[PDB]
Every structure is written in C-alpha cells, then in structure tokens.
Amino acid sequence: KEMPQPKTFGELKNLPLLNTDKPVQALMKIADELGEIFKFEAPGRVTRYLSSQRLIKEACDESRFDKNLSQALKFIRDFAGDGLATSWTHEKNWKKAHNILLPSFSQQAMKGYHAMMVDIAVQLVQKWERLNADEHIEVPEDMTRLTLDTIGLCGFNYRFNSFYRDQPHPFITSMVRALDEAMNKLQRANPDDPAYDENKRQFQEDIKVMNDLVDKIIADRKASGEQSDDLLTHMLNGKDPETGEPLDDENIRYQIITFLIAGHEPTSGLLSFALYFLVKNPHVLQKAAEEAARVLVDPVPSYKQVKQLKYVGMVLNEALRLWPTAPAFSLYAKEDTVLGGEYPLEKGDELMVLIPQLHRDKTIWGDDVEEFRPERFENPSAIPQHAFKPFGNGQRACIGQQFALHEATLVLGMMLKHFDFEDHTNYELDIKETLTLKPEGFVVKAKSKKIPLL
C-alpha cells in the first residue's frame, strides 16, 4: 500500500502545516481526512503519523520499535539534557536514572507524598472557599498553581507558593518561554540567521533562570541534611543496582529540570479537562460527587480513601481519552519490518503516535467516541491492547503516571466534596497548545457546600 500525504508547499513539503498555534489539532484534522496513517515530510525529514489502534499496537512492540526523540524533544534537550524524558534508551544515563528513580514512584512512595499533596490541595480548597459572592475561578490557572506547588514540595521540599501570587513564578515565565522557543525552532529554515540573535540570547537567559532555581534546590537540601526521603533524596543518594553507581552531578540537575516540568504541566491540563467534562455532563458530575461524599468521610482524605475513589479515577481516564495532555510520542524502527501487513519500513524509519486520534478509533470505542462516558474504563481487560496510551509505551512510559493520577484523584475528589460547580459562561472549548494541552479561558463558579476542613 502507498500511504497518503497531506498538501505540500513546494520545497517546504508539509512543514508549513505545522506553522499554526494549534499543530496537534491540525494533525488530528489531517488524520480525519486521510485515515490511519499519513506520510509527513519536511526539509531533510520524513515521519509517518499513526492514528489507528490496528497499527499503533504494532508500533508498541518494543522488539521492533524504540523511543525516538521528536524534533520537539531534541530542542528541549538543549536544557533538559540526558534527563529521563530527553534521553535515548541506549544512553547509559537513561537506564541508570530509570533504575534509581523507579522506587520514588512506588505505591509506598506515594504513601509518603500523600501528606504534602494534601497540603497543597487544602490551599486550593481554601482559596475557593474564600472567594466572594459571584466571583469566579480561572480553572487552568489554579490547576497549574496546584500541580506546580505539588511537584516542588513533594519532590524537592521547595515551596513555589503559587497561591500567594498573581503573576506566575519567574521559573514558569522562563520555562514557558524556553519551551516555546524550543518548539519555534522547528519552522526555522536558516536558524543562524542574525534575525534570531535576540531569541538565542533570551533562550540562554531563560535556561539560566531555570538552572539558578535548581542550584537553590540543591544547596538548600545539602544544608538541611538527608532527612526528607523525597525525589531529591533518591537523586542525591540512590545507587543503580546494575552499575552500582549514583547519578553524577550534571545529570541530577537535568533530572530536576525534567521533573519540575513533566511533574506539573500535563497534570494541570488533565485536571482542567476533567472539570470541563464534568460541568458539561452533569449526570457524570453528580455520580462523581456522590462517590466523593461517600468515601471522603474525614476532614482530609487518607491515602487509602484516594485509592477508593474508583469512579473519579474513571473520570480522569475518560478525560485522558478525549484530550491526552501529552498528546504525541515518537518511535523508530530497530530493524526492517512491515507495519500492518501493508507498509514496509526500513531500519531507522520514524513514526509519530497521534494519541488524541488513536483514542477516537471507532473500531475500538464505538461510534459515540466524542461522548464523555467514564464507564468505558470499568474494566482494563475489556480494552484492546494499546488502545489507550496517554502515558506512552513500554519501558519508556511515563515514570510519573501514578504520581499524576494520585494527585489528580485526591484534588478532584476534594473539589467534588466541597463545592457545587456552575458553567456560568457556557464556556466554548478552546484548546491552547504548549508542551501540553489546556482549555484556555475555562472559568467556573464554585458554590461552597460549607463542609469544614478541620
């Protein structure tokens, strides 16, 4: 089979199609038109976008395909280095850091993060309890405040104090600007053109702001003494069982940058989309709120109670199905192979997995794919293999998945226990694309049920 390809622009090939504010949504529309696979070419680059479970289930075979750094990840590697998310599987520091940090995400470790997650969640609840009559909530803004504070505290015992601020923390301003610059480089035909000198100077400044915070985090800890048993503790003291080695100092700094970014951005999108879908689907909101009231019987949730918020967990997975907030990942062929019995690939050929489109495969989910129905997730064994991939694949899947879902279930459960919510503007979904996806401008009103936190 010859695969289709979207419209071209002479020698720029397909690259101008991604010169848009919303490239993932542009790629979803191409997939809608062209189907389960299309060729995408740019000057000096070829990739193939996959959208069907039929093909992606083959692409997830780790004996045939390994993680590729997309151009986005390659440009982010200029400040995330060989941290876990921007390392190749074959670099020594990938497996070393993977082995050292996996126990920081055990369910036992989650039991230890729980109290600090509650600390920040209570700050969010108190903020909303303290709003005056007919004031409203800026939803992604507050969810980002929460997820940033949670990864700083839980992981590094650093307080960003986001709920004390209107303007984002300087780290965020620089992080956002550095991520946007990295992604802008994709469209630059002549990146050494002097027109980009200011962009380059600004990029170095933003990387320095980020690295200054990492130095502060490391110096604060080395003063305090090893007595926090958190992520930084393992980054500073853990030894890889295979090599016997600890992480070196340069790699630790890259991990701190990696986790501060990865540990907050897509989780804030997930919580924002989950609240969006609940207020748009009030029967679902009512069922989730009934579960919260029944389970969360104490002034703050326990670790076990969060594990018992089954339906809330289903709500989160169904929000990840429609808007997976880390919406793509890239693979390369380890050897010559044939995809789907129809598309021969050579060793080194690249693939992109377009996760939001995979999650709309009607052969898997039925024709009602656009509807919000958490009950699709009642049973993992009823979901075909590789049909649902919001956390990636295989040994390169998200190391933070359980942290993200514990945090999001805790927070959404407390939100549903403590407030009734109103979609007072009849909000029209507008999805902003950065490193992640978020519903821009999403606002609600939250009426307190007046249930105390002490």
Ligand code: HEM
């Ligand atoms: C709802 C929230 C999240 C989503 C949807 C998400 C999604 C993903 C995806 C799709 C990947 C694979 C990327 C690729 O193959 O290129 C990944 C990897 C990773 N994520 Fe997440 N993530 C989330 C939360 C987190 C959190 C909370 C952390 C840290 C606490 C984290 C840290 C990482 C890291 C370090 C990797 C690289 C893992 C490796 O390759 O060894 N993520 N994430």
Ligand SMILES: O=C(CCCCn1ccnc1)N[C@@H](Cc1ccccc1)C(=O)O
């Ligand atoms: O593939 C990634 C990188 C996604 C990173 C996902 N992520 C987030 C957190 N962890 C992982 N972008 C997509 C979409 C895109 C295209 C052009 C410009 C910008 C974006 C692509 O290049 O096709």
Ligand SMILES: CCCc1ccccc1
């Ligand atoms: C896949 C984790 C998100 C991330 C974090 C830092 C740098 C690149 C990607």
